[PDB]
């Protein structure tokens, strides 16, 4: 797996790829690892597929319930703190996952959460077996000043590198842009394919 | 007499304590719901009590999820506790199957809780009625529920003090498959029907949902245009 | 007096609270079932209450599984809670042995639950009677069940307000092994027998099952041809 | 008075609620059992209620296992629950030791359950008497059991409405060690003795077991030849 | 009044429900026990009720183990449950220490159970008295025990209807250390003393145990030679 | 009558025990809260009882956390136990999510506890009303809560003996968005309004909080300048 | 009235059921204890009931351990259960710390159990008083304990019917630090004081313990020399 | 009437059983505490009952720890059980945090227990008041606590029969920050004030603690110099 | 074991084979690994026979119960989500299985579910020791445009390959075709045998 999350001025961009392996055997080319879990919040999952999925459902549920009881969306830091507690409570029988939780409250935020419930905010983060290659690309090419279209390209690029050097990663790239104005928008396939072509790339 | 304990049948086969619990429902303000063309709506009276109470505080239409809403009438504490139960119950169904396929079953789960408190000694019944309205894989749905745990699906119904004036009025005027804007008018007429002698009808709440969409709560500016 | 608590025998050896629970059953609308040639059927009256109630909402014949159905009469909340129990109990038998061999035992498990609530203080009895009809490895089966937990297998029986008129009428006309189409007529006659003075009989429900097949619910167009 | 609660002794030392429970037993139809030459039998009256009730449905002699049977009289729901308890209790003894050596102990386990419900508040006694008959490593055995949890071993006994007419009649005619065919006649005579004024005795149930063999239920054709 | 609940002291400091429980004990037939030269014995009246009851069925002297026996009087169901408890309690002592050293402690364990049901609401006392007789590492022992949980060790005592006649009679005649054959005679005289006006004394039960030996139950042929 | 048990509805659908529990609230001294420009405040009367009581001992405004406060009126023991529950409930929300986003939910949790004691037998309701005031991600918030478990959000409200005098007075004078120093005056006027006939108003407690800041408790020197 | 339930205060703040429990204590025979020179003793009256009761059976002074004894008065069943509880409680203290340092704490543990049964519904108090006497690391100790759970340490005290005669007499004659032989005489004089009109005082029990030694029970030959 | 059960509000919002519990407190002997210069003290009357009771036995001032003491008044059994609870509660705080920082919280924990028994059926309130006095990180502290669970911090207060005479007298004479020797005199005067008509005041108990030090109990020789 | 599930325009096709081994020892030639569990849903089981069977029964039960309580069939994605939750709840003491769940709601669907409750939808999937040979055949020969008869042949072919190179697989091939029109139809043996002949094959 390769998932990545970056923050900008008034935006958050999340991307994954879609490959699912049971060892070296590519069982599904087209799984889903990026999920919207609130109006302005998304989550990416890496690690054991079963555990990750159970958590996606709990989160969707518990964040929708929060919203109705409070009439505001759960602050992104609160979402991370909630998960911190859930995962830690069961650290010795854990959910075997790596989560990125990204979104917009008063500002933008990306949080990275481990299987023991340690949560940390950074201005970018990546998770999964392909994550070090993304970190390489981001270290070199990321700027806080980047526009949204510059950022969308950046992640497409990063993941496309990760894909080439991680046999655990592959398939079409999913991207989502989260803004205060238009909310969580999942960029449509044909627009992403268009940019892979324009940057000159493969899968 | 046989009306002092929830577990005691009268000789005619009546649970009087349940029937009294039902009298608590009549003290609530009126609310109604009705099905229309590819949609369902709820309307509920707001008896304003004071300048000093916040208005967007306890009003009576509560979303259970994005596609399901409810109005209550009766003891307010018990209404709250049931709505919160209904909400939790909807999320459990969604975590088990990933979607609320039939709303009838959410209502059934709530109604079951309510009935349970009419069979064991040491608890009193919930003094509340509810209306549940929303869209699901069957279509638009409108239900009601009472202290006894009794369910009925309706085309239009009401709950609260003015229930009878309103059910009586819809019995004569209601038509299937109106457009939204007309249903809302017909609703407001029904509601006005229920007040006595040239008494004001201040801004009610209205919420609607139409197939393929999410719930929408009319804001009081939009609601005024029907007064 | 000795009629204030389910755990108290009268001096003649009567549990009056049970007998009163049974009076709750009489307030339900009539329903009947009868065995015929390689099959069994159920018929139940629909007292229509309003244009505004959905008709395919709470009607009284409920499938327990594909080969077993039930009608109830009495408190509707309690009927619901028992039907749902009967359904879960059938599935447990299927998971333990892969098939419901004798329906008598499904009924016995339901009746046991009902009896249990006539022996412990702090609970009231279920105010319901049921009829269970279906096919199993013995053949077609027709049972009834009451608040006391009392079981009987019948060739024909009724439950509800018009029970006596109907059991009285079948006592004179009923014949074993009719064809389906005639059983249904005989049933409809029995039901008509129970109304007073040139009163309308609106569309009842009818469901039937014949050996080797699954249950079928007559739709109201097919049902009309017997009125 | 002191007759409102199972846990309350009267001043003479009486548990009236237990005595009233016993009145429930008298409302059942008569049944009897008697020991004969290397065997024991049970006979029970069938008050036919209607053409419409299945006959091979609830009749009153129930096998507990292949070598032990029981008749009950009293509340039918409670009889059921006790027979099923007896059946489970027999199988537990067989799993612990591979064989039911003394039937007295099966009865004792059932009677103990029944007594237990005459000592704790919040439960009512079982309104049932039972007769247990079968063969074991001691020989043929005949027992009875009542709501209080009281056991007696008999040569002949009865339970039900006509208990006294029957116990009175066997007190005068009963002989030890008859042959099967004569014991059955003597039994039928006893039963007839208990009816009032030239009233019909329709087909009873008869079941017998003789040492070395399994239980056999007479079918109504064989039973007729004694009427 | 203060006699309706086991947990309620009267103003004079009386538990009336316990005293009434004691009245249940008086309805049982008389039984007595007495110590003699290196032994102890029990005698109990058999009021024969009918030809049709098996005699070697419920008679009242029960071995608790090979060296300890008990007679009871009062409610028969409760006697049974207490004898079976006593038996289990003896085996527990034997598994913990390999031998019942002091019988006083077996009695104490039973009496404790009995007392426990005179302190908590929601249970009624056991309506039974017992006599315990046997040999242990102290010598021959004779005890009694009542519904209240009260213990006394005796040289001779009785329980049942004719208690007072018998305790009165032994108060005058009883001598320590008689031989077995004379103690048994003295006992029978005591028992005869308690009947009114030239009334028959049919065969009682007698059981005895002497130091170094096991219990022996006199068979009715041997018992006759004392009538 | 129907006013002896919390679980018993009257025939008009009333829980009298709850309404009586509410009468306990009226015996407390008056307290009020009101929203103003970017803030909220609480004021509470101090009926001084004696020179010998420490003043900075039990006064009635309690911080729940740094941004949320409460005043109570009613039974003091129960007030204490609820404030301490409210405090623990706030910290739980903070450990689960790292911040108290909506105060409505803290109040809801407390009101739920209070309602729970109006549905089960064997517990009595809390005889307390509370006011909750603080700032959260929505803005300044003012709530009240009663023995029944009933919530309302207010712009201004009172609790205690002088509730009506004070709610009546604010109904006429209260204006939204005053500055702090004027809101406090208006409050003191309202409070003075509630005393009878030229009776002294000794130093009340005042606490306030404005958006962006923490709670501040006026010390009695600052408070005097408004008398 | 307010005397029917242990949990109910009268309007003057009285637990009448406790007070009545105390009246049970007065029906026991008198017993006394007194401190003397480096020792403490107990004396208890033996009202002989019959030649037929064993004397060395239930007498009232019971060793709790080798250095601690107790007398009881009141219901004998409850006394027993409390003495056995006191014995077990002493051993627990010895297993935890290897020695009973302060007897006050053994008494406190027993008294706590007794008080516990005067605060919860569904249990009745123990109808017993006790005196505890023994030596410990503080010195010789004499305590009493009542149904309410009330402790006092005494120089001399009594319990039972003749309490007041005896406490009155010691109030006038008792001296600290007598020798053993004289304390025992003074005690016997006190006891005699409590009987009416030239009534016999048969052999009481006497037990004593002096610092550095173990308890010793006077045998009735030694006891006679003081009569 | 509404005064038979702790869980029942009167119509004016009163828990009468609690108020009656309070009447138990008035039967205790008087005790008082007061703050002085860098210290706090307690004084309690000793109504001597008999030469025969040990004096250094149950006297009423009990150390909770080395820096905290308590006096009680009311039922002595319940006082004991609460003091022992207070003591355990203090040690828990010390084991969690290594020091008792605020005594208010020890009292709060005890008062909470007391309140808890005024909300659940099936328990009675503790019939006790307490005074708590000691030094902590805030300074010297003086509290009281009643059956209801009600706390107040005082400069001086009293509990017991003569409460009112004493609180009335200190209301007129008490001055802050006396020296120890004068506070003790003022106290003794207050106490004398409460007796009627030239009645003796025998040796009370006095205990005091001053900042930086441990508690000290005046021995009766030192106490006499203030009489 | 070899089981396979494929989707087409308005159809779902599932096939298994029938061999059951306890190690290298062929204990039964003729077990059953394809089951109908609703009107338009089927399930294939691979893995521990006991666990797989207990699940088949639960599913039959709980889907029949759903249908009566809701008067509609449980959506196929719901069936997969149900199983996801069941298997995950007990991930540390698991059902040792690999399930395919295939059927028709508004469209057709095949879901693959692992022993930890990870569920994924693909347009085809195979499970069991013979699965990689099926994946080889399918990769080469599968088209979305295939007609139903073309598909039935394709799976018969796939499994017949798997049978030849997996000693864990063998026996007669079961096939079921699930359409909105005719529902779950299990194709009769003699019709399958006929097609094995016509494609020119063995077992």
Curated annotation (Swiss-Prot), chains A, I:
It is found in: Cytoplasm. It is an enzyme of class 3 (hydrolase). The formation of the proteasomal ATPase PAN-20S proteasome complex, via the docking of the C-termini of PAN into the intersubunit pockets in the alpha-rings, triggers opening of the gate for substrate entry. Interconversion between the open-gate and close-gate conformations leads to a dynamic regulation of the 20S proteasome proteolysis activity. GO terms for molecular function: endopeptidase activity; threonine-type endopeptidase activity. GO terms for cellular component: cytoplasm; proteasome core complex, beta-subunit complex. InterPro entries: Ntn_hydrolases_N, Pept_T1A_Psome_bsu_arc, Pept_T1A_subB, Proteasome_bsu_CS, Proteasome_sua/b, Proteasome_suB-type. It catalyses: Cleavage of peptide bonds with very broad specificity. The active site is at 1 (nucleophile). Keywords: Autocatalytic cleavage, Cytoplasm, Hydrolase, Protease, Proteasome, Threonine protease, Zymogen. Its EC number is 3.4.25.1. PANTHER family: ATP-DEPENDENT PROTEASE SUBUNIT HSLV (PTHR32194:SF0), METALLOPROTEASE TLDD (PTHR32194). Component of the proteasome core, a large protease complex with broad specificity involved in protein degradation. The T.acidophilum proteasome is able to cleave oligopeptides after Tyr, Leu, Phe, and to a lesser extent after Glu and Arg. Thus, displays chymotrypsin-like activity and low level of caspase-like and trypsin-like activities. This is Proteasome subunit beta. The lineage of its organism: Archaea, Methanobacteriati, Thermoplasmatota, Thermoplasmata, Thermoplasmatales.
Curated annotation (Swiss-Prot), chains B, C, D, E, F, G, H:
PROSITE patterns: PROTEASOME_ALPHA_1, PROTEASOME_ALPHA_2. One of its GO terms (molecular function) is endopeptidase activity. Gene3D superfamilies: Glutamine Phosphoribosylpyrophosphate, subunit 1, domain 1 (3.60.20.10). One of its GO terms (biological process) is proteasomal protein catabolic process. It is found in: Cytoplasm. Keywords: Cytoplasm, Proteasome. Its main location: cytoplasm. HAMAP family: Proteasome_A_A. The configuration of the closed gate contains an opening large enough to allow rapid entry of tetrapeptides but able to impede the entry of proteins and longer peptides. Belongs to the peptidase T1A family. The 20S proteasome core is composed of 14 alpha and 14 beta subunits that assemble into four stacked heptameric rings, resulting in a barrel-shaped structure. The two inner rings, each composed of seven catalytic beta subunits, are sandwiched by two outer rings, each composed of seven alpha subunits. The catalytic chamber with the active sites is on the inside of the barrel. Has a gated structure, the ends of the cylinder being occluded by the N-termini of the alpha-subunits. Is capped at one or both ends by the proteasome regulatory ATPase, PAN. NCBIfam families: arc_protsome_A (TIGR03633), PRK03996.1 (NF003075). This is Proteasome subunit alpha. It comes from Thermoplasma acidophilum (strain ATCC 25905 / DSM 1728 / JCM 9062 / NBRC 15155 / AMRC-C165).
């Amino acid at each position: 797996t390769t998932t990545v999350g970056i923050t900008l001025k008034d935006a958050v961009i999340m991307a994954t790829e879609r490959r699912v392996t049971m060892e070296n055997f590519i069982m599904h080319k087209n799984g889903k690892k990026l999920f919207q879990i609130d109006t302005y919040t998304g989550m990416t999952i890496a690690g054991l597929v079963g555990d990750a999925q159970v958590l996606v459902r709990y989160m969707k549920a518990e964040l929708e319930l929060y919203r109705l009881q409070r009439r505001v969306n759960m602050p992104i830091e609160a979402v991370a703190t909630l998960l911190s507690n859930m995962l830690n409570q069961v650290k010795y029988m854990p959910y075997m996952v790596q989560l990125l939780v990204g979104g917009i409250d008063t500002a933008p935020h990306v949080f990275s959460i481990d299987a023991a419930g340690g949560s940390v905010e950074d201005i970018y983060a990546s998770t999964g077996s392909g994550s070090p290659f993304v970190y390489g690309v981001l270290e070199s090419q990321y700027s806080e000043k980047m526009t949204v279209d510059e950022g969308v390209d950046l992640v497409i690029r990063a993941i496309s590198a990760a894909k080439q050097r991680d046999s655990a990663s592959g398939g079409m790239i999913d991207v989502a842009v989260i803004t205060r104005k238009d909310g969580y928008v999942q960029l449509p396939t044909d627009q992403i394919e268009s940019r892979i072509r324009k940057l000159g790339l493969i899968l | 007499a046989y009306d002092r304990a929830i577990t005691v049948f009268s000789p005619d086969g009546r649970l009087f304590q349940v029937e009294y619990a039902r009298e608590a429902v009549k003290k609530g303000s009126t609310a109604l719901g009705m099905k229309f063309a590819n949609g369902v709506l709820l309307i509920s009276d707001k008896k304003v009590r004071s300048r000093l109470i916040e208005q967007n505080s306890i009003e009576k239409i509560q979303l259970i999820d994005d596609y399901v809403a409810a109005v209550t009438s009766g003891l307010v504490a018990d209404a709250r506790v049931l709505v919160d139960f209904a909400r939790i119950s909807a999320q459990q169904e969604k975590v088990t199957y990933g979607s609320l396929v039939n709303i009838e079953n959410l209502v059934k789960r709530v109604a079951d809780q309510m009935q349970q408190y009419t069979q064991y000694g040491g608890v009193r019944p919930y003094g509340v009625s509810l209306i549940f309205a929303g869209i699901d894989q069957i279509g638009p749905r409108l239900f009601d529920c009472d202290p006894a745990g009794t369910i009925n699906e309706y085309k239009a119904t009401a709950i609260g003090s003015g229930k009878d004036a309103v059910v009586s009025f819809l019995e004569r005027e209601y038509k299937e498959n109106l457009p939204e804007k007309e249903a809302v008018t017909l609703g407001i007429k029904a509601l006005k029907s229920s007040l006595e002698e040239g008494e004001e009808l201040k801004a009610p709440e209205i919420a609607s949902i139409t197939v393929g969409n999410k719930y929408r709560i009319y804001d009081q500016e939009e609601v005024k245009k029907f007064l």
